[PDB]
Amino acid sequence: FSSINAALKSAPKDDTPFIIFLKNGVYTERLEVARSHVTLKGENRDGTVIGANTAAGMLNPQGEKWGTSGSSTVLVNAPNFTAENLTIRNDFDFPANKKKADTDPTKLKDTQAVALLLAENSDKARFKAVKLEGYQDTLYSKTGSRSYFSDCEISGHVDFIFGSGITVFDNCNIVARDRSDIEPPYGYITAPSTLTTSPYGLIFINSRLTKEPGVPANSFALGRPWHPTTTFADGRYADPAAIGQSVFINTTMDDHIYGWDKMSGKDKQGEKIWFYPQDSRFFEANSQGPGAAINEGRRQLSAEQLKAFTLPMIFPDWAV
């Protein structure tokens, strides 16, 4: 087979399981998985790579802006998709773009570049030993998406694990990328937009919150409450029903974590409104490492509350 897309396109139009092996190498290619039960197994998680260069500010061949949702390298929008031993990355050079002068005509304002977008139909998304490379907005999940990440790696700095859907991480490595642009804060690990009606969002079980060699201490927030600007019946404003949930359990944290931080959104009159972590579903449970603290601003789960985040409870109808 020529490409990952050629293999997916050739697969029968039924809902039968389809396995695509990937021998080591770099596949500069974009994906939109519409077929269910598609499993992508690569030769090595580091050696096998799917990666395109797409920034939100960039223009499609049309050509209007791609946008955050359009910037995905691999866009999953089907149930039972699984990825095994491969890297999905966005080739966008965030640091170099920030290195560009303000006078530089090629510098972009919209700097988010999604590696993996798990859309509303991406149910039972399974991820055994997978690296996700990015800088801003690396992993994006939407309401309806239910995914399980085991023995996996995710890198980025600004809101690199963000969105609505249920996304669980078991014994995974969450890397905070270094930045030469700014003084701290450098970025924020999660930006959950978990809907008020949906009980689960971004969960981290037995995982590691690591930092890159250059990253200073107290430069990263665990989370930041994302209230997406949504066009409603009466106007377009930060969706109030989007009170995100990011939970960390038995997770060791390097010294770069300073805690949680707040998000600026837009009013019904179109003005800067602040959503605070206190009002958001941000919780910790027996988290370890130098970047772990307890204070007025680190709300922690009770023994009874922790019982709800058992893997069978969070995924009842899924074997996992």
End-to-end Cα spacing for the chain: 30
- The three-state DSSP-derived secondary structure of the chain is CCCHHHHHHHCCCCCCCEEEEECCEEECCCEEECCCCEEEEECCCCCEEEEECCCCCCECCCCCECCCCCCCCEEECCCCCEEEEEEEEECCCHHHHHHCCCCCCCCCCCCCCCCEEECCCCEEEEEEEEEEECCECCEEECCCCEEEEECCEEEECEEEEEECCEEEEECCEEEECCCCCCCCCCEEEEEECCCCCCCCCEEEECCEEEECCCCCCCCEEEECCCCCEEECCCCEEECCCCCCEEEEECCEECCCEEECCCEEEECCCCCEEEECHHHCEEEEECCECCCCCCCCCCCECCHHHHHHHCHHHHCCCCCC
The Cα-based distances of 37 to 10, 122, 169, 218 in angstroms read: 14, 10, 21, 42
User: Do the strands 18-22 and 252-253 form a parallel or antiparallel pair, or are they unpaired?
Assistant: unpaired
Residue 94 CB contacts under 8 Å (≥ 6 apart), including other chains: 111, 113, 135, 136
* Dihedral of the alpha carbons of 196, 250, 188, 78, in degrees to the nearest 10: -60
Residue 125 to residue 13: CA distance in whole angstroms: 20
Residue 256 to residue 163: CA distance in whole angstroms: 22
Instruction: Using the CB atoms, write b or e for 265-278: b if 16+ within 10 Å.
Output: beeeeeeebebebe
Residue 184 CB contacts under 8 Å (≥ 6 apart), including other chains: 216, 218, 219
Contact by Cβ (8 Å): 134, 90: yes
Domain ranges of the chain: 1-320
Topology given in CATH for the domain delimited by 1-320: Pectate Lyase C-like (2.160.20)
Residue 219 to residue 157: CA distance in whole angstroms: 10
- The three-state DSSP-derived secondary structure of 88-114 is EEECCCHHHHHHCCCCCCCCCCCCCCC
Q: Which tokens sit at 268?
A: 């019904």
Catalytically annotated residues: 137, 159
Q: Determination technique for this PDB entry?
A: X-ray
Residue 91 to residue 113: CA distance in whole angstroms: 8
Q: Which tokens sit at 313?
A: 């409870």
What resolution in angstrom units was achieved for this structure? Answer: 3.5
**Phi-psi bin for 318: left (phi > 0), alpha (psi -120 to 50), beta?**
beta
Burial class (CB in 10 A: 0-12, 13-18, 19+), 188: buried
Query: φ, ψ for residue 98 (rounded to 5)?
Result: -70, -30
Which residue from 230, 165, 161 is spatially nearest to 198, judged by alpha carbons? 165
